[PDB]
Swiss-Prot record:
Localisation: Membrane; Cytoplasm; Mitochondrion; Nucleus, Nucleoplasm
Motif BH1: positions: 82-102
Signals that turn on the gene: Expression increases early during phorbol ester-induced differentiation along the monocyte/macrophage pathway in myeloid leukemia cell line ML-1. Rapidly up-regulated by CSF2 in ML-1 cells. Up-regulated by heat shock-induced differentiation. Expression increases early during retinoic acid-induced differentiation.
Name of the gene encoding the protein in the UniProt record: MCL1
Family: Belongs to the Bcl-2 family.
Full-protein interval shown: 171 to 320 of 350
Motif (BH3): 39-53
Lineage start: Eukaryota, Metazoa, Chordata, Craniata, Vertebrata
Cross-link annotation Glycyl lysine isopeptide (Lys-Gly) (interchain with G-Cter in ubiquitin), location: 24, 27
Function: Involved in the regulation of apoptosis versus cell survival, and in the maintenance of viability but not of proliferation. Mediates its effects by interactions with a number of other regulators of apoptosis. Isoform 1 inhibits apoptosis. Isoform 2 promotes apoptosis.
Post-translational modifications reported in the UniProt record: Cleaved by CASP3 during apoptosis.
Motif (BH2): 134-149
Protein name: Induced myeloid leukemia cell differentiation protein Mcl-1
Subunit: Interacts with HIF3A (via C-terminus domain). Interacts with BAD, BOK, BIK and BMF. Interacts with PMAIP1. Interacts with BBC3. Isoform 1 interacts with BAX, BAK1 and TPT1. Heterodimer of isoform 1 and isoform 2. Homodimers of isoform 1 or isoform 2 are not detected. Isoform 2 does not interact with pro-apoptotic BCL2-related proteins. Interacts with RTL10/BOP. Interacts with BCL2L11; may sequester BCL2L11 to prevent its pro-apoptotic activity. Interacts with GIMAP5 and HSPA8/HSC70; the interaction between HSPA8 and MCL1 is impaired in the absence of GIMAP5.
Length: 150
């Protein structure tokens, strides 16, 4: 019964999976699909920029966390709650979180741990929704995300 969680996971999972594999998911979107489609298109544009600009920082974080398997992916939300909460909440920081997700998803594909990508998307979505639900609600959720970056 948690639409914010469901929609956020759908968007984040889609972005991480396509980033890691290079393949678009042809399956139709769930509820509020038009918005989710625009949110995904927005992440492709903004998140690809973030990944280019944040390579150094993202490599630094990946080295320190040393993520190599499902056990490391399952412990990630505890670390990322700390990292993500340690700064001003805005849409930019939220994109950075998801973009770091995509960066880690690409790494997981590289080391033949592609099966960890869905658990990673869950972890990222957990961090976002658990820490920022109230903020996301006030900022009009994914409709707000799309509008902000238009
Ligand atoms: C305000 O929006 C920013 O300025 C974004 C870019 C941006 C600019 C314009 C449009 C969209 C985005 N950038 C940042 O918010 C950040 C960049 C760094 C390097 C940090 S950090 O120092 O806290 N490191 C760190 C933090 C996270 C996160 F997101 F979970 F908090 C994951 C991974 C890393 Cl390595 S936050």
């Amino acid at each position: 019964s948690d639409e914010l969680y469901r929609q956020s996971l759908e968007i984040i999972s889609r972005y991480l999976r396509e980033q890691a594999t290079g393949a678009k998911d042809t399956k139709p979107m769930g509820r509020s699909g038009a918005t989710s489609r625009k949110a995904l298109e927005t992440l492709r544009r903004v998140g690809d920029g973030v990944q280019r600009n944040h390579e150094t920082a993202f490599q630094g974080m990946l080295r320190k966390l040393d993520i190599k398997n499902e056990d490391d992916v399952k412990s990630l939300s505890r670390v990322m709650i700390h990292v993500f909460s340690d700064g001003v909440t805005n849409w930019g920081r939220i994109v950075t979180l998801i973009s770091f997700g995509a960066f880690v998803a690409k790494h997981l594909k590289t080391i033949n741990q592609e099966s960890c990508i869905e658990p990673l998307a869950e972890s990222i979505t957990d961090v976002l929704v658990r820490t920022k639900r109230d903020w996301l609600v006030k900022q009009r959720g994914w409709d707000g995300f799309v509008e902000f970056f238009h």
